[PDB]
């Protein structure tokens, strides 16, 4: 596979995302602005 699976929980918080790509864009919140 590659992605598209549930154990993609955020490294900083604990938000789980379907794809790594979602987690990547999410990451910015933990310094830029929380959203
Ligand atoms: Zn997070």
Report CA(3)–ligand 1 centroid distance (Å): 18
Q: Beta strands 16-17 and 8-9: pairing type?
A: antiparallel
Residue 33's domain comprises 1-35
**16 phi and psi angles, rounded to 5 deg:** -90, 135
For residue 27, what are the contacts with CB-CB under 8 A and spacing of at least 6? 10, 11, 12
CA distance 16 to 9: 4
Quote the number of domains for the chain. 1
Report CA(19)–ligand 1 centroid distance (Å): 14
- The sign of the torsion formed by the CA atoms of 35, 21, 15, 6 equals positive
Q: Which of 16, 14, 12 is nearest to 27 (CA)?
A: 12
What is the number of alpha carbons within 13 Å of residue 27 lying toward its C-beta?
A: 9
The alpha-helical segments, DSSP class H, found in 1-35 are 20-27
Report CA(1)–ligand 1 centroid distance (Å): 23
Report CA(18)–ligand 1 centroid distance (Å): 13
CA distance 33 to 2: 29
Residue in this structure with the two tokens 């790509």, named with its chain if needed? 21
């Amino acid at each position: 596979g590659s992605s598209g699976k549930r154990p993609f929980v955020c490294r900083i918080c604990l938000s789980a995302f379907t794809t790594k790509a979602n987690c990547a864009r999410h990451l910015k919140v933990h310094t830029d602005t929380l959203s």
